[PDB]
Each structure stands twice: as C-alpha cells, then as structure tokens.
Design a protein around this ligand. Structure first.
Ligand SMILES: Brc1cc2nn[nH]c2cc1Br
Length: 332
C-alpha cells in the first residue's frame, strides 16, 4: 500500500527535512520562561502555562519526560517543518534545565476549553466549523509529508471566542515515506484505524482520517468514545459490530492480510449497523443527511477509500464555512 495523495513529498524535500536523527538542537535560554500553573499531565509530558519574562507574552511549556533523543528530535523537526501552517501549534523555543538537561518545548498559548465542557455547548454549525478547521491542519501536515497519528479531542485546542483551533501534541507524528513499515502502536486505542488493529504496517496519512471519523461520530452522536474497546483486539471487535464483518473480510483479502486466529475468533460475524441507529432525541439536532454521508465516507475499513482531508473540505456538510472563508480571501 502507498498513499494516493502527497505520496512523494519527502523526496521533493532535502534529506535534512525528514532525517530528524541528524538534527542539532539549538537550545534557547530556560531562564526566559517562568511556569505560572499546571494545565495537564500526559503519559510522558507535563504541560504548564508559562510567561515569557522578556515580552510578557503567555506561553505553554511542555516538559518532556525521557524518551529516546530520536523521539525528541522527531517532534522538534516536525514542529519546525510545520511552523506557520494553518491551525498548527507554533513552536517558539526549545530549552532544557541546566542541571537535569530535561528538554522543554515552548509554544504559543491557546485559551482552550476541555472538550468535555466545550462540546456540549456546540451547535450543528459550530461542529461544522471546527471540523473544517481541523481538516485544514491535517491537509497541511499531510501536504508536508507528515502524519499526526494521534488525532483525538484531547489534541485539539479550541479558543471558542476567537474561533481558533490548534492541532497539538506532535510527539507521535512521523514522516511518510512510501513503502515504509511503521509501528502500529500509535494513536490512542479508541481512535486507532483498522490498519493498526490488523497489523497493516505500510499505512499512511489516511490513518488520521479514521481517527477524525471517530472524533466526529463522538461529537454528532454524543457517544464518546464512539468505539470503546477494552484492548486492541476488542477495539476491532467494537468497529466490526458497527461496520460489519463482510467489509472487514473484503479489506483483509484486498491487502493480503491474515487475521490473527485469536482475533478472528473474537471478531466473529456481524451485520452492518446503519448510522441512523445512533440518532436519538438528545443528539438529533446535530445530525443531518450531510453529516451522516460525510461520516460514512471517513469510517471505512479500506484506508485508500476514505476521504482525504482536502476531499473532505469539499463535502456539502461544510458548504457554509467554506463559502464564508472564500469570501474573506477574495476581500484579502
Ligand atoms: Br493550550 C496548549 C496545551 C498543550 N498541551 N500540550 N501542548 C500544548 C500546547 C498548547 Br498551545
């Protein structure tokens, strides 16, 4: 398998663009940034609101727990390569404390609201807007030869008053090289695409579109996480109990994949459940024919059949936001 879009971006860039192990980090001065308060704990990073003591601007400080220097360099190189892209978090500095040498990334601050608080206050056209903004970030990173690999609400910061969206946490992101066999232990369980769950290692940007689909289903149906498996095997089972096993078997045959025997037994046999089955009185105001059609075109087993991010932006679901922003670029 090879990506059907942005296939060859990395050979159209100098070697130094993607060869992150060769990066030499130019460290800033740690004493320029003061921690103000904690905002979150990740598995191996800690995130603080900070202040730049020189220009007094707010910032976010991400302190990275030891992981291979290869991984720190990968995250830094990706953030540098994506700097200035639409709805991408902006990396402002790279510092480390004098004594422990633990690295910290300095970002531009975003006034986020927790999705558990924010999403219940979003109406139909708010969802259309923010998904469109997320698609702009994914199309951009894909166009620059990068797959995020951890798309989920927790990695999408939103300043709702300023309608500002930033795609964050590039620590699992990778460069796409056609033919490359990647680690399938990426993303977070509930957002993993079927390719990861069946050990299809030569996956591509389209992984991120499955993850987006999961996020989107969770929003419009108010069922989050939408696919709630108790382990990586059961994650496939939860997907198969919605999409059905007939489509799974077609997919496995196309890509010449032999399903693990234990996994095959766990998946069993299931009919496809129509998307309308998830509609209820509480969520119905968020569902339209256009939302269902868009969702259906994201959540497909076959990664090569999913909408790309740029194709998604053309879908009728986004008619209004697309027309509104096109007007402003004309005025520019
Ligand atoms: Br807001 C915000 C929160 C973050 N957590 N991890 N990285 C982050 C960057 C920004 Br900006």
């Amino acid at each position: 398998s090879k990506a059907r879009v942005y296939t060859d971006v990395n050979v159209l860039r100098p070697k130094e663009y993607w060869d992150y192990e060769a990066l030499t980090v130019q460290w800033g001065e740690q004493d320029n940034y003061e921690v103000v308060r904690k905002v979150g704990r990740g598995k191996y990073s800690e995130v603080f609101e900070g202040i730049n003591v020189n220009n007094n601007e707010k910032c976010i400080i991400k302190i990275l727990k030891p992981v291979k220097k290869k991984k720190i360099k990968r995250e830094i190189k990706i953030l540098q390569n994506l700097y200035g892209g639409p709805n991408i978090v902006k990396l402002l500095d790279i510092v480390r404390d004098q004594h422990s040498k633990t690295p910290s990334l300095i970002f531009e601050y975003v006034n986020n609201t927790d999705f558990k608080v924010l999403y219940p206050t979003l109406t139909d056209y708010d969802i259309r807007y923010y998904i469109y903004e997320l698609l702009k970030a994914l199309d951009y990173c894909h166009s620059q030869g990068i797959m995020h690999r951890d798309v989920k609400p927790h990695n999408v910061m939103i300043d709702h008053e300023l309608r500002k969206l930033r795609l964050i946490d590039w620590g699992l992101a990778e460069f796409y090289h056609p033919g490359k066999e990647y680690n399938v232990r990426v993303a977070s369980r509930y957002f993993k695409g079927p390719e990861l769950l069946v050990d299809l290692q030569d996956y591509d940007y389209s992984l991120d579109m499955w993850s987006l689909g999961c996020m989107f289903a969770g929003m419009i149906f108010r069922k989050e996480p939408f696919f709630y498996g108790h382990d990586n095997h059961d994650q496939l089972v939860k997907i198969a109990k919605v999409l059905g096993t007939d489509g799974l078997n077609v997919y496995l045959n196309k890509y010449r994949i032999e399903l693990d025997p234990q996994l095959e037994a766990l998946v069993g046999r299931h009919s496809r459940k129509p998307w309308t089955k998830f509609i209820n009185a509480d969520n119905q105001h968020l569902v339209s024919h256009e939302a269902i059609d868009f969702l259906d075109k994201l959540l497909r087993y076959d990664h090569q059949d999913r909408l790309t991010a740029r194709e998604a932006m053309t879908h009728p679901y986004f008619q209004q936001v697309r027309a509104a922003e096109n007007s402003t670029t004309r005025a520019l």
